[PDB]
Amino acid sequence: IFSANAWRAYDTASAERRLSGTPISFILL
Secondary structure (H helix, E strand, O other), rough: OOOOHHHHHHHHHHHOOOOOOHHHHHHHH
């Protein structure tokens, strides 16, 4: 969790786009 929501999130996993409908800036904060 610590590694994913630091290093993975900005690089590849905030462009995953969780849900797609509700807002990705607020949903992958």
